[PDB]
Amino acid sequence: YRHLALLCDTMTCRGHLMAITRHGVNRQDTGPLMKCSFEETVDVLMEA
DNA sequence: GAAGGGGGGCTATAAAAGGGGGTGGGGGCTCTCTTCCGCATCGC
Output the CA angle A42-A11-A31, nearest 5 degrees.
35
Q: Are A41 and A35 in contact (CB under 8 A)?
A: no
Q: Which nucleotides of B are covered by protein (CB under 7 A)?
A: 32-33
Nearest nucleotide to the CA of A19, by C1', is B32
Are A40 and A48 in contact by the 8 Å Cβ rule? The answer is: no
Residue type present at position A47: E
Q: What is the DSSP string of A1-48?
A: -HHHHHHHHHHHTTSS---SSHHHHTTSS--HHHHHHHS-HHHHHHH-
- C-alpha angle A27/A18/A3, rounded to 5°? 120
Distance CA A18, CA A43 (A): 20
CA of A3 to C1' of B22 (A): 88
Residue pair A31/A44 in contact (Cβ under 8 Å)? The answer is no
Angstrom resolution of this structure: 2.5
Measured in whole angstroms, how far is the alpha carbon of residue A32 from the centre of its chain? 11
Experimental approach taken: cryo-EM
